PDB file of C-alpha atoms in Angstrom:
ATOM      1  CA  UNK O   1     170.776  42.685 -91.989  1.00 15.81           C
ATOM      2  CA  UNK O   2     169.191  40.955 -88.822  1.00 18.41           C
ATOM      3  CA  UNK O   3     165.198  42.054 -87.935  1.00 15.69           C
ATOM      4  CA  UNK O   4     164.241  44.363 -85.273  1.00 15.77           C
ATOM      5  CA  UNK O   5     161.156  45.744 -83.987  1.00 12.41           C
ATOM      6  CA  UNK O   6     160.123  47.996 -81.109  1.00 13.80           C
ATOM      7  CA  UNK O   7     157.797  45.980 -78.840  1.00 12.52           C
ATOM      8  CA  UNK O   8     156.723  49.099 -76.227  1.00 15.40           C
ATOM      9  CA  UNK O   9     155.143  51.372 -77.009  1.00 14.47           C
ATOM     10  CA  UNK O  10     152.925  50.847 -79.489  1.00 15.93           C
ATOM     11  CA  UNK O  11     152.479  53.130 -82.576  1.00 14.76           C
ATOM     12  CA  UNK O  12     149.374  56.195 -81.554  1.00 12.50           C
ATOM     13  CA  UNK O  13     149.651  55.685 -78.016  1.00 14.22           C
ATOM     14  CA  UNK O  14     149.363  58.543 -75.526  1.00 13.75           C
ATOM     15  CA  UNK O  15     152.200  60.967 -74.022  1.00 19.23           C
ATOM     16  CA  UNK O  16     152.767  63.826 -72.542  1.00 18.05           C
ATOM     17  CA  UNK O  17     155.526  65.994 -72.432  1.00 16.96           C
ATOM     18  CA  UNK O  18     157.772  65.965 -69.040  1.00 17.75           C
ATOM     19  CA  UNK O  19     157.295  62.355 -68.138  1.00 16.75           C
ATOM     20  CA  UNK O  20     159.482  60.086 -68.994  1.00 17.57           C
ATOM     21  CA  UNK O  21     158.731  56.889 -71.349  1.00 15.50           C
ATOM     22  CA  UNK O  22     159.944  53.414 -71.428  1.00 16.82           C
ATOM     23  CA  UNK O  23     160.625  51.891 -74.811  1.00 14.26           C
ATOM     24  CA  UNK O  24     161.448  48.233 -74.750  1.00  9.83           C
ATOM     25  CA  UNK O  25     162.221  46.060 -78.050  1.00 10.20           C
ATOM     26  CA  UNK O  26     163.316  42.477 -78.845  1.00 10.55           C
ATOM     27  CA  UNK O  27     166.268  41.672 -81.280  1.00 13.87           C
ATOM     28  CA  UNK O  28     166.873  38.104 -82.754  1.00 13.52           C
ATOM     29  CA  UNK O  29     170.619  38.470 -82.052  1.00 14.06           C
ATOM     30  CA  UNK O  30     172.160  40.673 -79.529  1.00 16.15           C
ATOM     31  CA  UNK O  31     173.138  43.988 -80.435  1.00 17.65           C
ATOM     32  CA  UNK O  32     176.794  45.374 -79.816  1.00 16.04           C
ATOM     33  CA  UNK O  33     175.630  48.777 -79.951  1.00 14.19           C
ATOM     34  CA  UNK O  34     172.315  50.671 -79.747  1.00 10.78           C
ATOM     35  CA  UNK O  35     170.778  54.099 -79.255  1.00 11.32           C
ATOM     36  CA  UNK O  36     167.112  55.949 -78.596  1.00 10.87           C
ATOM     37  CA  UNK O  37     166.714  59.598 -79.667  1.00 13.64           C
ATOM     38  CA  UNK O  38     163.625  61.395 -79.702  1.00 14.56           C
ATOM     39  CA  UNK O  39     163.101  63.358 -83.073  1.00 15.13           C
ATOM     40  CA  UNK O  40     165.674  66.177 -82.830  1.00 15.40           C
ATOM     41  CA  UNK O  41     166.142  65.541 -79.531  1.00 19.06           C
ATOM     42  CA  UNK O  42     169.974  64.273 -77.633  1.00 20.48           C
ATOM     43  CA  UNK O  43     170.313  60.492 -78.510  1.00 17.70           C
ATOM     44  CA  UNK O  44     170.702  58.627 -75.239  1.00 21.29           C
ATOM     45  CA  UNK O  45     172.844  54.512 -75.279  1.00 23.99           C
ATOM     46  CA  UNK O  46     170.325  51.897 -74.364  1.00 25.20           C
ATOM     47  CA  UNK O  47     170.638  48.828 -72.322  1.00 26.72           C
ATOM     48  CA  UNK O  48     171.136  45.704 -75.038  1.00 24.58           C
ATOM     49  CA  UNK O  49     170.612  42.413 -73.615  1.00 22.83           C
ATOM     50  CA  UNK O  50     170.550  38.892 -75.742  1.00 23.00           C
ATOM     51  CA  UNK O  51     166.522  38.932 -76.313  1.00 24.24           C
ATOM     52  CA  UNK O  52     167.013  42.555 -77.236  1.00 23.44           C
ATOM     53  CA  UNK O  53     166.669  45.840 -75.112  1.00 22.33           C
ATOM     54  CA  UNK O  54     165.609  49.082 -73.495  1.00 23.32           C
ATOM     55  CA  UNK O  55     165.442  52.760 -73.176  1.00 19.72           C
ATOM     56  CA  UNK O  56     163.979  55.559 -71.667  1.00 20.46           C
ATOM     57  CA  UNK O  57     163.050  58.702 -73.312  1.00 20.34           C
ATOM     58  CA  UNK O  58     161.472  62.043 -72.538  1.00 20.68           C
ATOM     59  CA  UNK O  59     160.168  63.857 -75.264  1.00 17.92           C
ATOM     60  CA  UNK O  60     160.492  67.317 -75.912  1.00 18.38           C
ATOM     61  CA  UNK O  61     158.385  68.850 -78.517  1.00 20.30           C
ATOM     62  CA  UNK O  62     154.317  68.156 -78.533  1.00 20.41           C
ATOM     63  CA  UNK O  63     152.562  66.805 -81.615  1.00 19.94           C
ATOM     64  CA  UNK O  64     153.934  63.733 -82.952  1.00 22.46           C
ATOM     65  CA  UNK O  65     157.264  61.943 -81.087  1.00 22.70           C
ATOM     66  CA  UNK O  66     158.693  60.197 -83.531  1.00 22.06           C
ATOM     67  CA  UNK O  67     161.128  57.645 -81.106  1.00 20.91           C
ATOM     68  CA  UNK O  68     163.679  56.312 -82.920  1.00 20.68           C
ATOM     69  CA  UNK O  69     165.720  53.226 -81.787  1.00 19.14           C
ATOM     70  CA  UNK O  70     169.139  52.154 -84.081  1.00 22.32           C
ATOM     71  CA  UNK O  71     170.889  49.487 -83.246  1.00 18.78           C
ATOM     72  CA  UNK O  72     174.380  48.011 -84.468  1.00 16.38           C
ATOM     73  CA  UNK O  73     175.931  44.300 -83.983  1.00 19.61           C
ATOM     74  CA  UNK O  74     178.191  42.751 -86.161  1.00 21.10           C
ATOM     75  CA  UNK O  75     179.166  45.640 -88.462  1.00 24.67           C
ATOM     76  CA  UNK O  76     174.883  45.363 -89.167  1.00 24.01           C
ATOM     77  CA  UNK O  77     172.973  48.397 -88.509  1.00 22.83           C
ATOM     78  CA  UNK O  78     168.747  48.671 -88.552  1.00 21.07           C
ATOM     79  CA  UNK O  79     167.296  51.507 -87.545  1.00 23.90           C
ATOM     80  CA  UNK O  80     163.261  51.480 -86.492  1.00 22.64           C
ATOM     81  CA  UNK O  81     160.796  53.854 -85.246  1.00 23.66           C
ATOM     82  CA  UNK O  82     157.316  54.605 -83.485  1.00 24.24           C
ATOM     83  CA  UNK O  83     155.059  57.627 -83.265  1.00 21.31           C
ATOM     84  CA  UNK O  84     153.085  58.792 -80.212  1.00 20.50           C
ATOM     85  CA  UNK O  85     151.046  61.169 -79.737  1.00 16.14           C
ATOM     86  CA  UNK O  86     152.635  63.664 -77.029  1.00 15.24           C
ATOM     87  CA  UNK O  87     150.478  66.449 -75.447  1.00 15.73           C
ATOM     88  CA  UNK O  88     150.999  69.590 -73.229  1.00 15.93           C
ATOM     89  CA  UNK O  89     150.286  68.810 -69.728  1.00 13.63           C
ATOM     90  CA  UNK O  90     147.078  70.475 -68.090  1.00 14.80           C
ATOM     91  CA  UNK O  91     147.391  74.354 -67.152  1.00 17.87           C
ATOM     92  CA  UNK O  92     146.528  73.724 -64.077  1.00 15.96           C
ATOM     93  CA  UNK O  93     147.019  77.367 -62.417  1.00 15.07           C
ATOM     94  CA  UNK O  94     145.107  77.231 -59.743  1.00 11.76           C
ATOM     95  CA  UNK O  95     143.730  80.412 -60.011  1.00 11.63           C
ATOM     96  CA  UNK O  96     142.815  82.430 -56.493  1.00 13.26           C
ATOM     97  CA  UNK O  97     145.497  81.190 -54.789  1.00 11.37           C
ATOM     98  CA  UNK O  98     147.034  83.381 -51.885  1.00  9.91           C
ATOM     99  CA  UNK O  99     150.690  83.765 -51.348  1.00  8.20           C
ATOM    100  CA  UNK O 100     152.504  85.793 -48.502  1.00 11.57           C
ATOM    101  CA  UNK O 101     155.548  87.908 -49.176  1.00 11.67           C
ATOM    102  CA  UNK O 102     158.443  85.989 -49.907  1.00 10.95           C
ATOM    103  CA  UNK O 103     160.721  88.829 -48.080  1.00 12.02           C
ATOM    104  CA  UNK O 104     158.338  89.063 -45.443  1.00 11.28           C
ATOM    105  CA  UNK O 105     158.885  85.642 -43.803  1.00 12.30           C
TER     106      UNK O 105
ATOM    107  CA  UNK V   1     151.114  60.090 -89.500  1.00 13.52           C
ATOM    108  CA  UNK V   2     153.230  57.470 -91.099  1.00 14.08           C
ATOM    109  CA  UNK V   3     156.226  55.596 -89.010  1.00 11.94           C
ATOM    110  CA  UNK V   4     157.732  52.488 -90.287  1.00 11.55           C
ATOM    111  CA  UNK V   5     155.953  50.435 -88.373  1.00 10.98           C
ATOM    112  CA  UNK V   6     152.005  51.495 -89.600  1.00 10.02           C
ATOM    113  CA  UNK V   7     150.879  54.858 -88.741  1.00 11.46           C
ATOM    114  CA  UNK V   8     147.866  56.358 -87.129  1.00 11.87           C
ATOM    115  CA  UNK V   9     145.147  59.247 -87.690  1.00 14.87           C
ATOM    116  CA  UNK V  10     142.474  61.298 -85.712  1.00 13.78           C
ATOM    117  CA  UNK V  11     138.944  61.350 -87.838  1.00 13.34           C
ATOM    118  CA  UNK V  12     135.774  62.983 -87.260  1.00 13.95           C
ATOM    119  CA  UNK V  13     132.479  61.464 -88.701  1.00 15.32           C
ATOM    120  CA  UNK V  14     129.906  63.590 -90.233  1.00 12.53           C
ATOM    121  CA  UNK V  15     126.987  61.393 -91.467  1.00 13.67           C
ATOM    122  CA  UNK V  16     124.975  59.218 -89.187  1.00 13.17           C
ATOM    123  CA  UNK V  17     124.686  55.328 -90.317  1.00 16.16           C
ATOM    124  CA  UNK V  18     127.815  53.493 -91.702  1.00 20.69           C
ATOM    125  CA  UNK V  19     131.076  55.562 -91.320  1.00 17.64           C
ATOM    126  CA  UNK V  20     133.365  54.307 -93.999  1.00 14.32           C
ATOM    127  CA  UNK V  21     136.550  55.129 -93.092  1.00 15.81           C
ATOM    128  CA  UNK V  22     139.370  54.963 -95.821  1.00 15.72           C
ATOM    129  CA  UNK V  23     142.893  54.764 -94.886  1.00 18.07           C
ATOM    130  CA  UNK V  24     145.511  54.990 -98.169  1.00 16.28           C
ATOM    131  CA  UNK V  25     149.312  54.791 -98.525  1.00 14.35           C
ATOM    132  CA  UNK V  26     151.510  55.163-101.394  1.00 12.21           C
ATOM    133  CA  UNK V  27     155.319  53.777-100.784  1.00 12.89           C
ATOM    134  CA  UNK V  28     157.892  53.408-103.078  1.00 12.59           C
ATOM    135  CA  UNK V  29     155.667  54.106-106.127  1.00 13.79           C
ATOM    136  CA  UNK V  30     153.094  51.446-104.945  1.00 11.80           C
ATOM    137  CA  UNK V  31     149.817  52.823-103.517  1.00 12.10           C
ATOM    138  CA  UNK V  32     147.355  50.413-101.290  1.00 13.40           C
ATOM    139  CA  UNK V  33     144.004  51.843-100.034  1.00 12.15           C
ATOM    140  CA  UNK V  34     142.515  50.109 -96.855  1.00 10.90           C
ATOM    141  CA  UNK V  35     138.850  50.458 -95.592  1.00 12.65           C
ATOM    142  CA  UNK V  36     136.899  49.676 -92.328  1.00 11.22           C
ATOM    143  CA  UNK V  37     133.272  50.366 -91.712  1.00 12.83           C
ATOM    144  CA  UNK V  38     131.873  51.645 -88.042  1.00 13.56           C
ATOM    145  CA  UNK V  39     128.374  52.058 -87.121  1.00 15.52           C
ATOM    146  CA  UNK V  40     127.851  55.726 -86.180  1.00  9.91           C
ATOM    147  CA  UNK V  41     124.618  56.646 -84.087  1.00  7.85           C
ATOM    148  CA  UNK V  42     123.052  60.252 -83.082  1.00  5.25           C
ATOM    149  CA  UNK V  43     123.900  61.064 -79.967  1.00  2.00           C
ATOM    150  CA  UNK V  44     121.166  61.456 -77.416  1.00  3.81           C
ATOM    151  CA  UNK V  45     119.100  64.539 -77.567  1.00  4.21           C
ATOM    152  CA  UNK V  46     119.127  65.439 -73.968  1.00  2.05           C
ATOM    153  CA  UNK V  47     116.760  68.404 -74.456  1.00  2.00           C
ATOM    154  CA  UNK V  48     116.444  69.327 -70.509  1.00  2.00           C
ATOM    155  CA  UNK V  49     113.097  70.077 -70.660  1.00  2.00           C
ATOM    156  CA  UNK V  50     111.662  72.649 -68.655  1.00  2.00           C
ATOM    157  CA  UNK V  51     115.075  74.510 -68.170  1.00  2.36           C
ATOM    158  CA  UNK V  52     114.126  77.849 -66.372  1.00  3.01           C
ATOM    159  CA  UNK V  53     116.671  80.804 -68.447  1.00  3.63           C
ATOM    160  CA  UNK V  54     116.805  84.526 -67.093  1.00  2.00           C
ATOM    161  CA  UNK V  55     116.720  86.950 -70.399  1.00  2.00           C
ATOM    162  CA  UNK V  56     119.823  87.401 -71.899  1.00  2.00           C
ATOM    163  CA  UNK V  57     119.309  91.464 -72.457  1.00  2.02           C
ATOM    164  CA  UNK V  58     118.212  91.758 -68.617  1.00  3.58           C
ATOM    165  CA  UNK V  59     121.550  90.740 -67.101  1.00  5.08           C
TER     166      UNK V  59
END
């Protein structure tokens, strides 16, 4: 089957959960078909151009996304995939804070 | 952490000097060991000298 690699993002970069991510990859022949799930996550159709394509993802689950972009063209499917390291956003609670009565207003 | 593509890890060096970090992978029955050495230093003593502490069984 043809070649494919994911050129964005790279493998061990940073994430965090919430914000969506843009992963970008080259083909050397344009794809019919192609997808981008996250882990277990819902697999979402990605934009295939001749030079190859793109998708963006939101991961779900912290730890380690595994991103995993399959793509099919001429009855040839390849399948690749990066890991980045996703974290849980800052607490950030603010603590202190003074609210007035929502049935009061 | 392994991905097709490579993989990554998180280490934490112990011994002041020459941090030899080892990175091995076995695939398919076929197992390659990688190595890369990084100078590690103390880190800075930062005493803070004449610090003035209230006693701990006072407060």
């Amino acid at each position: 089957p043809f070649t494919l690699n994911i050129t964005s993002p790279t493998n061990g970069a940073a994430a965090t959960t919430g914000t969506p991510i843009r992963v970008v990859f080259t083909s050397s022949v344009a794809l019919s078909s192609a997808t981008c799930k996250i882990g277990n996550s819902a697999a979402v159709n990605a934009q295939v151009s001749s030079t190859g394509g793109y998708c963006d993802v939101t991961p779900t689950t912290a730890g380690g996304g595994l991103i995993t972009v399959t793509g099919t063209a001429n009855g040839q499917t390849v399948s690749s995939t990066v890991t980045v390291d996703v974290k849980a956003p800052v607490v950030d609670n603010r603590y202190g804070t003074v609210t007035p009565a929502g049935d009061q207003e």
